[PDB]
JSON list of C-alpha atoms in Angstrom, two decimals:
[
{"chain": "A", "resi": 1, "resn": "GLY", "atom": "CA", "xyz": [4.83, 1.67, -17.08]},
{"chain": "A", "resi": 2, "resn": "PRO", "atom": "CA", "xyz": [3.18, -1.07, -14.97]},
{"chain": "A", "resi": 3, "resn": "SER", "atom": "CA", "xyz": [0.05, -0.67, -17.11]},
{"chain": "A", "resi": 4, "resn": "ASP", "atom": "CA", "xyz": [1.51, -3.13, -19.61]},
{"chain": "A", "resi": 5, "resn": "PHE", "atom": "CA", "xyz": [2.27, -5.60, -16.80]},
{"chain": "A", "resi": 6, "resn": "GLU", "atom": "CA", "xyz": [-0.26, -7.89, -15.11]},
{"chain": "A", "resi": 7, "resn": "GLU", "atom": "CA", "xyz": [0.03, -7.52, -11.33]},
{"chain": "A", "resi": 8, "resn": "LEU", "atom": "CA", "xyz": [-2.50, -10.18, -10.24]},
{"chain": "A", "resi": 9, "resn": "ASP", "atom": "CA", "xyz": [-4.20, -7.67, -7.86]},
{"chain": "A", "resi": 10, "resn": "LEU", "atom": "CA", "xyz": [-1.15, -7.86, -5.56]},
{"chain": "A", "resi": 11, "resn": "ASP", "atom": "CA", "xyz": [-1.06, -4.05, -5.61]},
{"chain": "A", "resi": 12, "resn": "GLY", "atom": "CA", "xyz": [-4.56, -3.51, -4.27]},
{"chain": "A", "resi": 13, "resn": "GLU", "atom": "CA", "xyz": [-5.44, -2.72, -0.68]},
{"chain": "A", "resi": 14, "resn": "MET", "atom": "CA", "xyz": [-6.86, -5.70, 1.19]},
{"chain": "A", "resi": 15, "resn": "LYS", "atom": "CA", "xyz": [-10.33, -4.98, 2.54]},
{"chain": "A", "resi": 16, "resn": "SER", "atom": "CA", "xyz": [-10.62, -4.20, 6.25]},
{"chain": "A", "resi": 17, "resn": "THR", "atom": "CA", "xyz": [-13.84, -3.57, 8.13]},
{"chain": "A", "resi": 18, "resn": "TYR", "atom": "CA", "xyz": [-11.65, -2.20, 10.94]},
{"chain": "A", "resi": 19, "resn": "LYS", "atom": "CA", "xyz": [-10.19, 0.55, 8.75]},
{"chain": "A", "resi": 20, "resn": "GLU", "atom": "CA", "xyz": [-13.55, 1.37, 7.16]},
{"chain": "A", "resi": 21, "resn": "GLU", "atom": "CA", "xyz": [-15.22, 1.75, 10.56]},
{"chain": "A", "resi": 22, "resn": "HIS", "atom": "CA", "xyz": [-12.52, 3.52, 12.57]},
{"chain": "A", "resi": 23, "resn": "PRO", "atom": "CA", "xyz": [-11.07, 6.77, 11.22]},
{"chain": "A", "resi": 24, "resn": "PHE", "atom": "CA", "xyz": [-7.36, 6.86, 10.42]},
{"chain": "A", "resi": 25, "resn": "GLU", "atom": "CA", "xyz": [-6.76, 9.67, 12.93]},
{"chain": "A", "resi": 26, "resn": "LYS", "atom": "CA", "xyz": [-7.99, 7.51, 15.82]},
{"chain": "A", "resi": 27, "resn": "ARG", "atom": "CA", "xyz": [-6.25, 4.38, 14.57]},
{"chain": "A", "resi": 28, "resn": "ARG", "atom": "CA", "xyz": [-2.93, 6.15, 14.21]},
{"chain": "A", "resi": 29, "resn": "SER", "atom": "CA", "xyz": [-3.26, 7.76, 17.64]},
{"chain": "A", "resi": 30, "resn": "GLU", "atom": "CA", "xyz": [-3.91, 4.34, 19.18]},
{"chain": "A", "resi": 31, "resn": "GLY", "atom": "CA", "xyz": [-1.13, 2.56, 17.29]},
{"chain": "A", "resi": 32, "resn": "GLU", "atom": "CA", "xyz": [1.42, 5.23, 18.14]},
{"chain": "A", "resi": 33, "resn": "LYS", "atom": "CA", "xyz": [0.40, 5.06, 21.80]},
{"chain": "A", "resi": 34, "resn": "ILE", "atom": "CA", "xyz": [0.51, 1.25, 21.91]},
{"chain": "A", "resi": 35, "resn": "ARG", "atom": "CA", "xyz": [3.93, 1.16, 20.21]},
{"chain": "A", "resi": 36, "resn": "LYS", "atom": "CA", "xyz": [5.29, 3.73, 22.69]},
{"chain": "A", "resi": 37, "resn": "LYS", "atom": "CA", "xyz": [3.86, 1.88, 25.72]},
{"chain": "A", "resi": 38, "resn": "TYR", "atom": "CA", "xyz": [4.75, -1.69, 24.62]},
{"chain": "A", "resi": 39, "resn": "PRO", "atom": "CA", "xyz": [7.89, -1.51, 22.45]},
{"chain": "A", "resi": 40, "resn": "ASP", "atom": "CA", "xyz": [8.52, -5.29, 22.56]},
{"chain": "A", "resi": 41, "resn": "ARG", "atom": "CA", "xyz": [5.02, -6.09, 21.20]},
{"chain": "A", "resi": 42, "resn": "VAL", "atom": "CA", "xyz": [3.34, -5.18, 17.92]},
{"chain": "A", "resi": 43, "resn": "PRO", "atom": "CA", "xyz": [-0.36, -4.45, 17.21]},
{"chain": "A", "resi": 44, "resn": "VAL", "atom": "CA", "xyz": [-1.95, -6.64, 14.55]},
{"chain": "A", "resi": 45, "resn": "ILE", "atom": "CA", "xyz": [-5.48, -6.56, 13.07]},
{"chain": "A", "resi": 46, "resn": "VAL", "atom": "CA", "xyz": [-6.58, -9.99, 11.78]},
{"chain": "A", "resi": 47, "resn": "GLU", "atom": "CA", "xyz": [-9.64, -10.20, 9.52]},
{"chain": "A", "resi": 48, "resn": "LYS", "atom": "CA", "xyz": [-11.22, -12.66, 7.08]},
{"chain": "A", "resi": 49, "resn": "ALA", "atom": "CA", "xyz": [-10.72, -12.27, 3.34]},
{"chain": "A", "resi": 50, "resn": "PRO", "atom": "CA", "xyz": [-14.06, -11.51, 1.59]},
{"chain": "A", "resi": 51, "resn": "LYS", "atom": "CA", "xyz": [-14.42, -14.82, -0.27]},
{"chain": "A", "resi": 52, "resn": "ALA", "atom": "CA", "xyz": [-13.12, -17.03, 2.54]},
{"chain": "A", "resi": 53, "resn": "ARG", "atom": "CA", "xyz": [-15.33, -19.84, 3.82]},
{"chain": "A", "resi": 54, "resn": "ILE", "atom": "CA", "xyz": [-13.80, -20.34, 7.26]},
{"chain": "A", "resi": 55, "resn": "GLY", "atom": "CA", "xyz": [-14.53, -19.90, 10.95]},
{"chain": "A", "resi": 56, "resn": "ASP", "atom": "CA", "xyz": [-14.89, -16.42, 12.38]},
{"chain": "A", "resi": 57, "resn": "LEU", "atom": "CA", "xyz": [-12.47, -14.72, 14.73]},
{"chain": "A", "resi": 58, "resn": "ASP", "atom": "CA", "xyz": [-14.32, -13.31, 17.73]},
{"chain": "A", "resi": 59, "resn": "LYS", "atom": "CA", "xyz": [-11.37, -10.95, 18.44]},
{"chain": "A", "resi": 60, "resn": "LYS", "atom": "CA", "xyz": [-9.49, -9.13, 15.67]},
{"chain": "A", "resi": 61, "resn": "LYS", "atom": "CA", "xyz": [-7.01, -6.95, 17.62]},
{"chain": "A", "resi": 62, "resn": "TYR", "atom": "CA", "xyz": [-3.83, -8.66, 18.89]},
{"chain": "A", "resi": 63, "resn": "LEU", "atom": "CA", "xyz": [-0.84, -7.22, 20.75]},
{"chain": "A", "resi": 64, "resn": "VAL", "atom": "CA", "xyz": [1.75, -9.79, 19.94]},
{"chain": "A", "resi": 65, "resn": "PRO", "atom": "CA", "xyz": [5.24, -10.46, 21.35]},
{"chain": "A", "resi": 66, "resn": "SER", "atom": "CA", "xyz": [7.60, -9.21, 18.69]},
{"chain": "A", "resi": 67, "resn": "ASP", "atom": "CA", "xyz": [9.64, -12.45, 18.72]},
{"chain": "A", "resi": 68, "resn": "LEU", "atom": "CA", "xyz": [6.58, -14.69, 18.11]},
{"chain": "A", "resi": 69, "resn": "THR", "atom": "CA", "xyz": [7.10, -16.35, 14.75]},
{"chain": "A", "resi": 70, "resn": "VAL", "atom": "CA", "xyz": [4.53, -16.14, 11.97]},
{"chain": "A", "resi": 71, "resn": "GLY", "atom": "CA", "xyz": [4.18, -19.93, 12.25]},
{"chain": "A", "resi": 72, "resn": "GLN", "atom": "CA", "xyz": [3.36, -19.72, 15.96]},
{"chain": "A", "resi": 73, "resn": "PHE", "atom": "CA", "xyz": [0.78, -16.99, 15.28]},
{"chain": "A", "resi": 74, "resn": "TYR", "atom": "CA", "xyz": [-0.61, -19.16, 12.52]},
{"chain": "A", "resi": 75, "resn": "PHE", "atom": "CA", "xyz": [-1.19, -22.13, 14.84]},
{"chain": "A", "resi": 76, "resn": "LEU", "atom": "CA", "xyz": [-2.65, -19.86, 17.53]},
{"chain": "A", "resi": 77, "resn": "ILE", "atom": "CA", "xyz": [-5.18, -18.45, 15.03]},
{"chain": "A", "resi": 78, "resn": "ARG", "atom": "CA", "xyz": [-5.99, -21.94, 13.70]},
{"chain": "A", "resi": 79, "resn": "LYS", "atom": "CA", "xyz": [-6.81, -22.99, 17.27]},
{"chain": "A", "resi": 80, "resn": "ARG", "atom": "CA", "xyz": [-8.84, -19.86, 17.93]},
{"chain": "A", "resi": 81, "resn": "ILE", "atom": "CA", "xyz": [-10.83, -20.42, 14.72]},
{"chain": "A", "resi": 82, "resn": "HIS", "atom": "CA", "xyz": [-11.34, -24.02, 15.93]},
{"chain": "A", "resi": 83, "resn": "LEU", "atom": "CA", "xyz": [-10.06, -25.11, 12.53]},
{"chain": "A", "resi": 84, "resn": "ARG", "atom": "CA", "xyz": [-9.87, -28.82, 11.82]},
{"chain": "A", "resi": 85, "resn": "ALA", "atom": "CA", "xyz": [-6.30, -30.10, 11.50]},
{"chain": "A", "resi": 86, "resn": "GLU", "atom": "CA", "xyz": [-6.82, -31.14, 7.88]},
{"chain": "A", "resi": 87, "resn": "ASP", "atom": "CA", "xyz": [-8.33, -27.80, 6.77]},
{"chain": "A", "resi": 88, "resn": "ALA", "atom": "CA", "xyz": [-6.28, -25.07, 5.10]},
{"chain": "A", "resi": 89, "resn": "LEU", "atom": "CA", "xyz": [-5.52, -21.59, 6.44]},
{"chain": "A", "resi": 90, "resn": "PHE", "atom": "CA", "xyz": [-3.54, -18.85, 4.69]},
{"chain": "A", "resi": 91, "resn": "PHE", "atom": "CA", "xyz": [-2.31, -15.45, 5.92]},
{"chain": "A", "resi": 92, "resn": "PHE", "atom": "CA", "xyz": [-1.85, -12.46, 3.62]},
{"chain": "A", "resi": 93, "resn": "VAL", "atom": "CA", "xyz": [0.06, -9.24, 4.31]},
{"chain": "A", "resi": 94, "resn": "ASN", "atom": "CA", "xyz": [-0.47, -6.79, 1.44]},
{"chain": "A", "resi": 95, "resn": "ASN", "atom": "CA", "xyz": [-1.81, -9.77, -0.56]},
{"chain": "A", "resi": 96, "resn": "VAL", "atom": "CA", "xyz": [1.28, -11.99, -0.12]},
{"chain": "A", "resi": 97, "resn": "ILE", "atom": "CA", "xyz": [1.72, -15.00, 2.17]},
{"chain": "A", "resi": 98, "resn": "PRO", "atom": "CA", "xyz": [4.53, -14.37, 4.70]},
{"chain": "A", "resi": 99, "resn": "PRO", "atom": "CA", "xyz": [7.26, -16.91, 5.62]},
{"chain": "A", "resi": 100, "resn": "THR", "atom": "CA", "xyz": [6.45, -18.86, 8.77]},
{"chain": "A", "resi": 101, "resn": "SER", "atom": "CA", "xyz": [10.03, -18.33, 10.04]},
{"chain": "A", "resi": 102, "resn": "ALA", "atom": "CA", "xyz": [9.67, -14.53, 10.11]},
{"chain": "A", "resi": 103, "resn": "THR", "atom": "CA", "xyz": [8.90, -12.93, 13.44]},
{"chain": "A", "resi": 104, "resn": "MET", "atom": "CA", "xyz": [5.80, -10.83, 13.93]},
{"chain": "A", "resi": 105, "resn": "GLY", "atom": "CA", "xyz": [8.09, -7.93, 14.86]},
{"chain": "A", "resi": 106, "resn": "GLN", "atom": "CA", "xyz": [9.87, -8.27, 11.51]},
{"chain": "A", "resi": 107, "resn": "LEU", "atom": "CA", "xyz": [6.55, -8.50, 9.64]},
{"chain": "A", "resi": 108, "resn": "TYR", "atom": "CA", "xyz": [5.37, -5.37, 11.46]},
{"chain": "A", "resi": 109, "resn": "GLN", "atom": "CA", "xyz": [8.60, -3.46, 10.90]},
{"chain": "A", "resi": 110, "resn": "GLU", "atom": "CA", "xyz": [8.54, -4.20, 7.18]},
{"chain": "A", "resi": 111, "resn": "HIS", "atom": "CA", "xyz": [4.81, -3.93, 6.47]},
{"chain": "A", "resi": 112, "resn": "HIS", "atom": "CA", "xyz": [2.91, -1.89, 9.08]},
{"chain": "A", "resi": 113, "resn": "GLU", "atom": "CA", "xyz": [0.70, 0.83, 7.65]},
{"chain": "A", "resi": 114, "resn": "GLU", "atom": "CA", "xyz": [0.77, 4.54, 8.47]},
{"chain": "A", "resi": 115, "resn": "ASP", "atom": "CA", "xyz": [-1.63, 4.02, 11.39]},
{"chain": "A", "resi": 116, "resn": "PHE", "atom": "CA", "xyz": [1.07, 1.82, 13.03]},
{"chain": "A", "resi": 117, "resn": "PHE", "atom": "CA", "xyz": [-1.02, -1.35, 12.75]},
{"chain": "A", "resi": 118, "resn": "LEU", "atom": "CA", "xyz": [-0.05, -4.51, 10.88]},
{"chain": "A", "resi": 119, "resn": "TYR", "atom": "CA", "xyz": [-3.00, -5.90, 8.90]},
{"chain": "A", "resi": 120, "resn": "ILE", "atom": "CA", "xyz": [-3.31, -9.64, 8.23]},
{"chain": "A", "resi": 121, "resn": "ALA", "atom": "CA", "xyz": [-6.10, -11.19, 6.21]},
{"chain": "A", "resi": 122, "resn": "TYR", "atom": "CA", "xyz": [-6.85, -14.90, 6.45]},
{"chain": "A", "resi": 123, "resn": "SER", "atom": "CA", "xyz": [-8.62, -17.32, 4.13]},
{"chain": "A", "resi": 124, "resn": "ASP", "atom": "CA", "xyz": [-9.13, -20.97, 3.30]},
{"chain": "A", "resi": 125, "resn": "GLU", "atom": "CA", "xyz": [-7.96, -20.05, -0.21]},
{"chain": "A", "resi": 126, "resn": "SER", "atom": "CA", "xyz": [-4.33, -19.64, -1.27]},
{"chain": "A", "resi": 127, "resn": "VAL", "atom": "CA", "xyz": [-5.14, -16.41, -3.19]},
{"chain": "A", "resi": 128, "resn": "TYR", "atom": "CA", "xyz": [-6.54, -13.32, -1.50]},
{"chain": "A", "resi": 129, "resn": "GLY", "atom": "CA", "xyz": [-10.02, -12.44, -2.73]}
]
């Protein structure tokens, strides 16, 4: 009975141009192969939320050391966006902001999709939209 509960759109699928443009069969094949070849790294797709007003990421596909913390990945992306120090940046995994002390391997292990990719959306806003 979640119909009588407000879920704040935290149950919806975050948009991904990557998923819309590449068929699941090919994505899953690639993610399974990359996980088998590089077990101590995890594949991550990083894309802008639709309403974000923030610098673009030239490259969206990352193969990340599993022990890299979310905070470290955060600062790396801030630098690659060329974001000013005083400007805000938020990550969302399935619409919720992850802890910066988690590792990317943990994030992947708990939240990767059935194509074996972890999807992260980023925005200047604290709510995904």
